[PDB]
Design an enzyme around this catalytic site. Structure first.
Site, PDB file in Angstrom:
ATOM      1  N   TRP A   2       2.063  -0.452   3.690  1.00 18.56           N
ATOM      2  CA  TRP A   2       0.645  -0.125   3.648  1.00 18.56           C
ATOM      3  C   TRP A   2       0.275   0.272   2.225  1.00 18.56           C
ATOM      4  CZ3 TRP A   2       3.840   2.582   7.240  1.00 18.56           C
ATOM      5  CH2 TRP A   2       4.304   3.822   6.790  1.00 18.56           C
ATOM      6  N   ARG A  60       9.433   4.537  -1.065  1.00 14.76           N
ATOM      7  CA  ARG A  60      10.785   4.407  -0.536  1.00 14.76           C
ATOM      8  C   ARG A  60      11.234   5.530   0.425  1.00 14.76           C
ATOM      9  NH1 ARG A  60      14.117   3.175  -6.057  1.00 14.76           N
ATOM     10  NH2 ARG A  60      12.213   3.816  -7.114  1.00 14.76           N
ATOM     11  N   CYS A  75       9.019   0.841  -6.443  1.00 19.89           N
ATOM     12  CA  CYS A  75       8.289   1.202  -5.237  1.00 19.89           C
ATOM     13  C   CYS A  75       8.229   2.713  -5.002  1.00 19.89           C
ATOM     14  CB  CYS A  75       8.873   0.545  -3.991  1.00 19.89           C
ATOM     15  SG  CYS A  75       7.879   0.914  -2.509  1.00 19.89           S
ATOM     16  N   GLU A  86      -4.027   1.403  -5.709  1.00 14.78           N
ATOM     17  CA  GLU A  86      -3.795  -0.033  -5.915  1.00 14.78           C
ATOM     18  C   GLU A  86      -5.113  -0.796  -5.789  1.00 14.78           C
ATOM     19  OE1 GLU A  86       0.165  -1.239  -4.031  1.00 14.78           O
ATOM     20  OE2 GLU A  86      -0.390   0.326  -2.603  1.00 14.78           O
TER      21      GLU A  86
HETATM   22  C1  HEM Z   1       5.728   1.482   3.213  1.00 16.25           C
HETATM   23  C2  HEM Z   1       4.620   1.621   2.475  1.00 16.25           C
HETATM   24  C3  HEM Z   1       4.713   1.295   0.975  1.00 16.25           C
HETATM   25  C4  HEM Z   1       3.989   1.823  -0.009  1.00 16.25           C
HETATM   26  C5  HEM Z   1       2.919   2.922   0.152  1.00 16.25           C
HETATM   27  C6  HEM Z   1       4.434   1.192  -1.236  1.00 16.25           C
HETATM   28  C7  HEM Z   1       3.963   1.450  -2.491  1.00 16.25           C
HETATM   29  C8  HEM Z   1       4.179   0.671  -3.596  1.00 16.25           C
HETATM   30  C9  HEM Z   1       3.392   0.671  -4.809  1.00 16.25           C
HETATM   31  C10 HEM Z   1       2.112   1.532  -5.112  1.00 16.25           C
HETATM   32  C11 HEM Z   1       3.967  -0.228  -5.621  1.00 16.25           C
HETATM   33  C12 HEM Z   1       3.462  -0.588  -7.026  1.00 16.25           C
HETATM   34  C13 HEM Z   1       2.972  -2.033  -6.922  1.00 16.25           C
HETATM   35  C14 HEM Z   1       1.839  -2.444  -7.845  1.00 16.25           C
HETATM   36  O1  HEM Z   1       1.065  -1.580  -8.354  1.00 16.25           O
HETATM   37  O2  HEM Z   1       1.703  -3.680  -8.033  1.00 16.25           O
HETATM   38  C15 HEM Z   1       5.122  -0.798  -4.951  1.00 16.25           C
HETATM   39  C16 HEM Z   1       6.003  -1.741  -5.419  1.00 16.25           C
HETATM   40  C17 HEM Z   1       7.031  -2.377  -4.745  1.00 16.25           C
HETATM   41  N1  HEM Z   1       7.422  -2.178  -3.425  1.00 16.25           N
HETATM   42 FE1  HEM Z   1       6.486  -0.917  -2.209  1.00 16.25          FE
HETATM   43  N2  HEM Z   1       5.436   0.293  -0.955  1.00 16.25           N
HETATM   44  C18 HEM Z   1       5.606   0.313   0.403  1.00 16.25           C
HETATM   45  C19 HEM Z   1       6.469  -0.458   1.121  1.00 16.25           C
HETATM   46  C20 HEM Z   1       7.324  -1.388   0.634  1.00 16.25           C
HETATM   47  C21 HEM Z   1       8.109  -2.289   1.445  1.00 16.25           C
HETATM   48  C22 HEM Z   1       8.112  -2.416   2.982  1.00 16.25           C
HETATM   49  C23 HEM Z   1       8.834  -3.025   0.610  1.00 16.25           C
HETATM   50  C24 HEM Z   1       9.815  -4.116   1.045  1.00 16.25           C
HETATM   51  C25 HEM Z   1      10.753  -3.816   1.943  1.00 16.25           C
HETATM   52  C26 HEM Z   1       8.539  -2.617  -0.745  1.00 16.25           C
HETATM   53  C27 HEM Z   1       9.094  -3.092  -1.889  1.00 16.25           C
HETATM   54  C28 HEM Z   1       8.484  -3.004  -3.109  1.00 16.25           C
HETATM   55  C29 HEM Z   1       8.856  -3.788  -4.264  1.00 16.25           C
HETATM   56  C30 HEM Z   1       9.986  -4.830  -4.370  1.00 16.25           C
HETATM   57  C31 HEM Z   1       7.904  -3.359  -5.351  1.00 16.25           C
HETATM   58  C32 HEM Z   1       7.862  -3.923  -6.779  1.00 16.25           C
HETATM   59  C33 HEM Z   1       6.895  -5.101  -6.635  1.00 16.25           C
HETATM   60  C34 HEM Z   1       6.823  -6.039  -7.808  1.00 16.25           C
HETATM   61  O3  HEM Z   1       7.636  -5.897  -8.768  1.00 16.25           O
HETATM   62  O4  HEM Z   1       5.926  -6.932  -7.761  1.00 16.25           O
HETATM   63  N3  HEM Z   1       7.625  -1.592  -0.697  1.00 16.25           N
HETATM   64  N4  HEM Z   1       5.224  -0.221  -3.724  1.00 16.25           N
HETATM   65  C1  LIG Z   2       3.418 -10.977 -12.814  1.00 21.68           C
HETATM   66  C2  LIG Z   2       4.024 -10.020 -11.826  1.00 21.68           C
HETATM   67  C3  LIG Z   2       5.385  -9.682 -11.845  1.00 21.68           C
HETATM   68  C4  LIG Z   2       5.904  -8.788 -10.891  1.00 21.68           C
HETATM   69  N1  LIG Z   2       7.221  -8.445 -10.871  1.00 21.68           N
HETATM   70  N2  LIG Z   2       5.064  -8.255  -9.969  1.00 21.68           N
HETATM   71  C5  LIG Z   2       3.747  -8.581  -9.950  1.00 21.68           C
HETATM   72  C6  LIG Z   2       2.858  -7.968  -8.927  1.00 21.68           C
HETATM   73  C7  LIG Z   2       1.658  -7.421  -9.676  1.00 21.68           C
HETATM   74  C8  LIG Z   2       1.986  -6.097 -10.348  1.00 21.68           C
HETATM   75  N3  LIG Z   2       0.883  -5.213  -9.999  1.00 21.68           N
HETATM   76  C9  LIG Z   2      -0.132  -5.843  -9.172  1.00 21.68           C
HETATM   77  C10 LIG Z   2       0.531  -7.138  -8.699  1.00 21.68           C
HETATM   78  O1  LIG Z   2       1.174  -6.988  -7.431  1.00 21.68           O
HETATM   79  C11 LIG Z   2       0.290  -6.946  -6.319  1.00 21.68           C
HETATM   80  C12 LIG Z   2       1.122  -6.449  -5.159  1.00 21.68           C
HETATM   81  N4  LIG Z   2       1.704  -5.150  -5.433  1.00 21.68           N
HETATM   82  C13 LIG Z   2       2.332  -4.400  -4.362  1.00 21.68           C
HETATM   83  C14 LIG Z   2       1.475  -4.355  -3.087  1.00 21.68           C
HETATM   84  F1  LIG Z   2       0.246  -3.911  -3.321  1.00 21.68           F
HETATM   85  F2  LIG Z   2       1.277  -5.569  -2.607  1.00 21.68           F
HETATM   86  C15 LIG Z   2       2.188  -3.536  -2.040  1.00 21.68           C
HETATM   87  C16 LIG Z   2       1.787  -2.225  -1.806  1.00 21.68           C
HETATM   88  C17 LIG Z   2       2.410  -1.461  -0.829  1.00 21.68           C
HETATM   89  C18 LIG Z   2       3.443  -2.021  -0.088  1.00 21.68           C
HETATM   90  C19 LIG Z   2       3.841  -3.327  -0.311  1.00 21.68           C
HETATM   91  F3  LIG Z   2       4.830  -3.826   0.428  1.00 21.68           F
HETATM   92  C20 LIG Z   2       3.223  -4.095  -1.286  1.00 21.68           C
HETATM   93  C21 LIG Z   2       3.194  -9.461 -10.871  1.00 21.68           C
END
Ligand code: HEM
Ligand SMILES: Cc1cc(N)nc(C[C@@H]2CNC[C@@H]2OCCNCC(F)(F)c2cccc(F)c2)c1
Ligand code: HEM
Ligand SMILES: Cc1cc(N)nc(C[C@@H]2CNC[C@@H]2OCCNCC(F)(F)c2cccc(F)c2)c1
Ligand SMILES: C[C@H](O)[C@H](O)[C@H]1CNc2nc(N)[nH]c(=O)c2N1
Ligand SMILES: C[C@H](O)[C@H](O)[C@H]1CNc2nc(N)[nH]c(=O)c2N1
Ligand SMILES: [Zn+2]
EC number: 1.14.13.39
Lengths: 405, 403
Positions: free
Chosen positions: A281, A112, A109, A286
């Site tokens: 947000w 953070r 993320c 994205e």
């Molecule tokens: C506050 C505004 C936030 C922004 C701008 C942000 C931004 C991002 C971005 C750009 C990603 C990459 C995800 C992707 O491309 O699929 C990501 C991943 C992630 N964020 Fe955030 N994030 C935010 C808030 C949060 C919050 C509130 C949480 C939970 C408390 C969080 C937990 C995570 C986690 C666990 C991932 C990895 C997701 C996955 O593996 O699917 N983030 N974040």
């Molecule tokens: C298959 C698989 C495994 C894994 N660990 N994770 C995924 C999410 C995929 C990764 N890439 C696009 C899609 O995830 C879509 C959601 N990604 C994060 C977000 F856009 F929803 C988000 C943005 C800002 C704040 C927030 F709280 C959440 C897929």
């Protein structure tokens, strides 16, 4: 320096050593023989107790009470409980601390710097799928705040022995339908074909658009999932337009305001919350780069290039690059217009540099997944590209989990 | 044991079995991944690296287990047993150099791996001779714009004495001159090497693009200074398809990307000076070299020329200007008839190389952060391709600056 990872910033020439990684209690997928750091997915009794002990120590440290009467009594309280039931329960403030810590600990993320500001909604009293719907709708109302978005997470009841899970089936709370066609093509979002098909099987009457909001498939323990439709007034959306290119608005593109992940496990001191959706947000890229340009998603690059009148015949016209910038810009411009919170990839990456600096002073390190932190356009134009990072698993954690079907 | 490699654009899946032949350990452990770090930090050993390489050689010309294999293996035992080391035959070195490129995880250009002119310079004995060899390599590799990949292999390392070295990091680089105002004119990456040149008695220009001289080091000798005949160094004035003003920026780059500070290991032997060159991929120049903040840092100048809004970052002026500079480079190189490849064509060919390697070898060691280009990452199919990274030999290793 010592036997902790040495970490360089190649733009500035600055060095840090990661000492936080020492804290890691769970192996990632790499070995000295091979680096597997770019894989998206890799893979009772004492084991539980030790994890629980570790978290309670963590909680007490954060309130600066390590070694004290209440700290040791709580430990003894946790043991007591696990001894007679095999599980235990968090206290209100323990859950708040953990949830926030899981966000802090998420290597993927970029957002953070915001870790410390997070509305934790306790929904561990939830008892039915209907009640989940309610809980989820309050979350969407709170978090959306008419466009002035606020980070939140609603936590439903933890996994129990031989008892079913609470699960949200949708990967996100708000996602668009994808409908498979006669042609083989997909109308809508191709990511969501399966879940769309699952909804129709569970009685959803589908629409026929590029942007239909999915209904929710929610599952209380041991029942099959019930279907719930979000009232349209609850789902904020931003029609897409470009600042200077007047035709863009005519494409009829749009996205939703609230990015709410809903299919992740929140693991705190051994306890597992199978349903605990969180939301923040968007970062501009994205939507603009991934959702709208990925060849396996909406794939609008060709279309937009054509509108822009670029040479799509040859790669070297950088037609893909030219279009993708305007789509990205159109995303930002439009969210800004609709006064809905967004952050662009420059601003975001700058602030994660600041987060890195903070976490260095506070914990001595910050686990970070480089390929994920660096944005999908304009990589080396952002400060994070030039920053070496260490990836490692810390706990509390958000953990991916397989689809429930 | 065998890792599953998925590609998320297409959903196709392979298993890498090639990584089992890796004998040299990387920087990751199960406790933490260090894969974004740029750098790391006796007869039995050498003899077994040497057999394993000779095996790789005879196997590669299909003669594995024949006479010429057996007696060559013995030629190796005999040489190490008596001298502590051994030497390679020309054909073997040729096979090993190509294999070193093939094995290079950070190279997006490996489709080309088998096409490589190898120049044998192991009969080199002076920095004078080094210079001639390097000058021939440049004439060969440049070929009036029709770039041909080449390598030149100087004499190996030896326990007795110091190394043959090329002090320069590339054969062709632009000088960086520290000004009084604590500012850098020219290329900020080459400040230290420029100060070394001047210290060994070079007369400096004061332009933004002054080709540095070569500092060449024969064993245990003070390095020597050699100026490159300006006619050998092909350069490219940068102009823009549609923006007439761009050319008046006076920007320019050199044709030949030729790395000269990397150590080449084959069969346990070490070649401390073995420059190699191919041709550029445009983002290298357009994105990194010209827009990196610790390099020429021209982004803002160019965006202001484009009359964009610097004041705020949500207008995406960094991205907008970044694209025009990449465009200018492509256009300019294609106009000067000099090989260059854009990031889309290159990543498309890298995907195919991954395919060929899969059929031929069971995988391809690859370093995702280096393969994915520095702009429009997810726009390229490499972005969606999982990648395993590990060290196979023959390899190029990074090495300490000789000073
Ligand atoms: C506050 C505004 C936030 C922004 C701008 C942000 C931004 C991002 C971005 C750009 C990603 C990459 C995800 C992707 O491309 O699929 C990501 C991943 C992630 N964020 Fe955030 N994030 C935010 C808030 C949060 C919050 C509130 C949480 C939970 C408390 C969080 C937990 C995570 C986690 C666990 C991932 C990895 C997701 C996955 O593996 O699917 N983030 N974040
Ligand atoms: C298959 C698989 C495994 C894994 N660990 N994770 C995924 C999410 C995929 C990764 N890439 C696009 C899609 O995830 C879509 C959601 N990604 C994060 C977000 F856009 F929803 C988000 C943005 C800002 C704040 C927030 F709280 C959440 C897929
Ligand atoms: C044919 C044209 C070639 C292209 C387009 C190409 C492309 C690239 C690129 C873009 C990089 C990363 C550059 C960076 O950002 O620093 C790279 C790295 C590398 N390439 Fe190539 N390459 C080519 C030929 C070669 C040749 C001829 C060799 C040697 C036989 C080679 C061996 C390597 C090695 C060892 C690296 C690692 C760079 C480092 O560690 O600094 N490549 N290649
Ligand atoms: C400190 C350090 C460590 C390391 N492993 N590597 C370096 C070279 C840096 C990395 N990033 C830019 C610069 O290297 C210079 C450019 N590298 C590759 C290339 F441009 F030389 C090239 C391109 C196409 C064909 C070809 F043969 C060569 C520095
Ligand atoms: C194979 C590769 O790891 C995969 O395509 C990753 C790369 N980086 C990413 N980074 C983010 N933020 N989100 C993603 O989905 C991906 N995809
Ligand atoms: C810190 C980070 O690993 C470093 O900036 C890498 C990232 N990816 C790269 N990729 C290429 N091709 N060349 C580079 O110099 C770098 N730099
Ligand atoms: Zn790793």
């Amino acid at each position: 320096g010592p036997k902790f990872p040495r970490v360089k910033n190649w733009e500035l020439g600055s060095i840090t050593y990661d000492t936080l990684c020492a804290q890691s209690q769970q192996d990632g997928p790499c070995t000295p023989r091979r680096c597997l750091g770019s894989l998206v997915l890799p893979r009772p009794a004492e084991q539980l107790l030790s994890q629980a002990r570790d978290f309670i120590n963590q909680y007490y440290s954060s309130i600066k009470r390590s070694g004290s009467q209440a700290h040791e009594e709580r430990l003894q309280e946790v043991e007591a409980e696990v001894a007679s039931t095999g599980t235990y329960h968090l206290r209100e403030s323990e859950l708040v601390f953990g949830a926030k810590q899981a966000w802090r600990n998420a290597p993927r993320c970029v957002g953070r710097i915001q870790w410390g500001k997070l509305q934790v909604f306790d929904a561990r009293d939830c008892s039915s799928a209907q009640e989940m719907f309610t809980y989820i709708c309050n979350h969407i109302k709170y978090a959306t705040n008419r466009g002035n978005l606020r980070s939140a997470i609603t936590v439903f009841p933890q996994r129990a022995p031989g008892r079913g899970d609470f699960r949200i089936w949708n990967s996100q709370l708000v996602r668009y339908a994808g409908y498979r066609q006669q042609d083989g093509s997909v109308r809508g979002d191709p990511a969501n074909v399966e879940i769309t098909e699952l909804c129709i099987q569970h009685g959803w009457t589908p629409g026929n658009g590029r942007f239909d909001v999915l209904p929710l498939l929610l599952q209380a323990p041991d029942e099959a999932p019930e279907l719930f439709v979000l009232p349209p007034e609850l789902v904020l959306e931003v029609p897409l337009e470009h600042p200077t290119l007047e035709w863009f608005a005519a494409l009829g593109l749009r996205w939703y305001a609230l990015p709410a992940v809903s299919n992740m496990l929140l693991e705190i001191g051994g306890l597992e919350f199978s349903a605990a959706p969180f939301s923040g947000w968007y970062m501009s890229t994205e939507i603009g780069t991934r959702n709208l340009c990925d060849p396996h998603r909406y794939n609008i690059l060709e279309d937009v290039a054509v509108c822009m009148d670029l040479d799509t015949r040859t790669t070297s016209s950088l037609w893909k690059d030219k279009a993708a910038v305007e789509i990205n810009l159109a995303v930002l411009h439009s969210f800004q217009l609709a006064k809905v919170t967004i952050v662009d990839h420059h601003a975001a990456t700058v602030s994660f540099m600041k987060h890195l600096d903070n976490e260095q002073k506070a914990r001595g390190g910050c686990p970070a997944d480089w390929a994920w932190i660096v944005p999908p356009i304009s990589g080396s134009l952002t400060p994070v590209f030039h920053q070496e990072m260490v990836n490692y698993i810390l706990s509390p954690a958000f953990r991916y989990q397989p689809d429930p079907w």
